[PDB]
Design a protein around this ligand. Sequence first.
Ligand code: HEM
Ligand code: HEM
Ligand code: HEM
Ligand code: HEM
Ligand SMILES: [C-]#N
Ligand SMILES: [C-]#N
Ligand SMILES: [C-]#N
Ligand SMILES: [C-]#N
Lengths: 146, 146, 141, 141
Amino acid sequence: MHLTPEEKSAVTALWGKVNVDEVGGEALGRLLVVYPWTQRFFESFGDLSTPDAVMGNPKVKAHGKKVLGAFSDGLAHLDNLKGTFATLSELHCDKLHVDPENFRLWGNVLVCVLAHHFGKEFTPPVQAAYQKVVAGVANALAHKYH
Amino acid sequence: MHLTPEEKSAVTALWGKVNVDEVGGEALGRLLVVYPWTQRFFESFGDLSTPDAVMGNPKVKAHGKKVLGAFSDGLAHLDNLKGTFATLSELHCDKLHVDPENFRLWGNVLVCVLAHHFGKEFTPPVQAAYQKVVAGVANALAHKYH
Amino acid sequence: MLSPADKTNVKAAWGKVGAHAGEYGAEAFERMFLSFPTTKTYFPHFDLSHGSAQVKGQGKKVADALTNAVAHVDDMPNALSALSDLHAHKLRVDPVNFKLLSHCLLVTLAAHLPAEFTPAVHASLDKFLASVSTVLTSKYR
Amino acid sequence: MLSPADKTNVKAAWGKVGAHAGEYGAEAFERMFLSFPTTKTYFPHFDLSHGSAQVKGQGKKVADALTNAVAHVDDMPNALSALSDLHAHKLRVDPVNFKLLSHCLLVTLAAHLPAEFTPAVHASLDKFLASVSTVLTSKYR
Ligand code: HEM
Ligand code: HEM
Ligand code: HEM
Ligand code: HEM
Ligand SMILES: [C-]#N
Ligand SMILES: [C-]#N
Ligand SMILES: [C-]#N
Ligand SMILES: [C-]#N
């Protein structure tokens, strides 16, 4: 992952106007609805049978927030992504047994969510820089699978 | 990528009995036949219309050898894969514009080729260690795409 | 392919796109080119600047066939047959690029259709885009 | 799906496997489990030791449905329909695992069928395995 300083600050400028509260659940939620097999990992969260159910779940909403927090941590340490996400990598490989491929799908949904949210402000060059960040994060998290 | 010392030596013990000459073209060749879109990158090699044509091409055979050489270089520097493949990463991203996803497909064909070649000697634990090496190599090569 | 509820969501969302289909396609390419530079190589003789009429044209060409696909969502493989041979046999397009484009399309829709891009509609368009990709790469494996 | 030349190659290669189909399947699982530990989680109550009768059984169950698939290679989606709902709706199997298993199957075939695993036959079995996966994951998207 190699962002220019221009890319790093734009990413940073945008994320400031981001309310992890709502967006946190929009991303998790949409991950569950759009890639249904992921529901399997969250079976204690309750009902995720319909989009409504999922977009209504308060554990979904609460967990989402926590995830985007973790993500915000990375944005603050863009040069040390791997070291930032080492624990979480270990957790997802050795406790939850998540296939690293799903980290990629996750990065794509967050990107659609940011697009939805910021509309015309999510310009093509802004998406370009977030695509890189998102791949970086997928990679750090898969790091301790190898 | 994290191989045990047991994994590193077994990988090393097996690769010694490997003739890059033939196997080099069996892997490239099979990559072309099994994932046909890759032919696009090798259009100056001549005809690749049929398996025969591809498995008969002398540029295919010659190039294969070169690739497995490069690969042997990595096996000799398993702790510095990225630094070992940096130039080649740059080359495949900036000159050839190969999608890094195809590095994964490549690693899978080499593994089938080693299986075919060594038969019963390619035990499940031996495949496990080669799967890791192969992912490591895919990752080093994709490194300079990020 | 595609549930009936899905079909309803596709038919509807595409209605909202309406006359912006060609516009939306072009923006999807510009996004793709910027985000995944590897893709540029499939259009060597094109001016890929922002408002290139050449990229506008490929958008409409893509948006139109998507529309044709919506129109024959029950016979896509026969509906997209020619486009399947062209991209696989003559163009030799790497399957991963159809995922790249589809994703850039979703991003574009999301940014222009804020009220209509519910989780539900997002899932339907994804399965729709995934189905089109699958038809167009069918000739490979 | 699948060219006729492909079909001929599948029908033939599977003949060579013959009575080793159950044996071959079990070895494919052992390879998969070792190579991709993430997959073990789908069989929590199993003894996954080497010669486990439980893993042997899943091999035959897989080898048999593959054989059924070879037998109805022209109506797979209707031929595998029940297995499609079971893996997607009740099991919620991650699509990536079907690629993992398919690959481990190819590796196993390659090591036991040295004269028969030509580049040509390897391409045919790959497209065949890819088609089975696609049917079994159809219910997702
Ligand atoms: C960039 C992507 C991701 C990040 C940053 C991330 C991070 C986290 C964090 C911060 C935790 C909680 C750690 C703790 O409380 O100790 C967590 C847990 C978890 N993650 Fe992720 N995650 C990601 C992706 C995924 C994906 C794609 C899946 C599976 C489809 C997943 C599944 C889970 C599960 C099952 C839990 C625990 C649920 C619970 O305890 O209620 N994660 N994740
Ligand atoms: C682990 C996988 C791979 C390794 C180690 C590797 C390595 C190499 C090496 C050593 C060269 C030559 C460098 C030189 O002569 O300066 C090369 C060139 C090339 N590679 Fe790869 N490669 C890999 C994968 C791929 C894949 C999957 C594709 C595309 C489908 C590809 C396409 C090419 C092309 C088009 C050339 C140049 C052909 C020519 O000049 O005749 N490579 N590769
Ligand atoms: C759902 C996705 C897609 C659809 C519906 C689609 C459709 C089409 C159609 C209808 C044409 C024109 C046929 C003609 O003029 O005879 C075309 C051509 C073409 N497509 Fe696609 N396309 C898709 C994706 C892609 C992708 C992902 C790439 C490459 C990254 C690509 C590359 C090309 C090329 C190279 C041409 C023609 C080049 C030129 O005329 O300058 N297509 N496409
Ligand atoms: C082409 C690939 C596959 C075929 C043909 C296949 C087929 C089958 C069949 C016929 C059954 C038994 C149905 C019954 O007993 O009612 C079954 C069950 C099952 N399959 Fe698959 N399978 C495939 C792949 C996979 C993969 C990749 C996984 C998971 C990594 C998986 C996991 C399971 C589970 C969890 C069960 C039942 C658990 C148990 O009975 O203990 N399958 N499969
Ligand atoms: C993680 N959710
Ligand atoms: C590289 N071949
Ligand atoms: C193709 N556009
Ligand atoms: C499933 N075996």
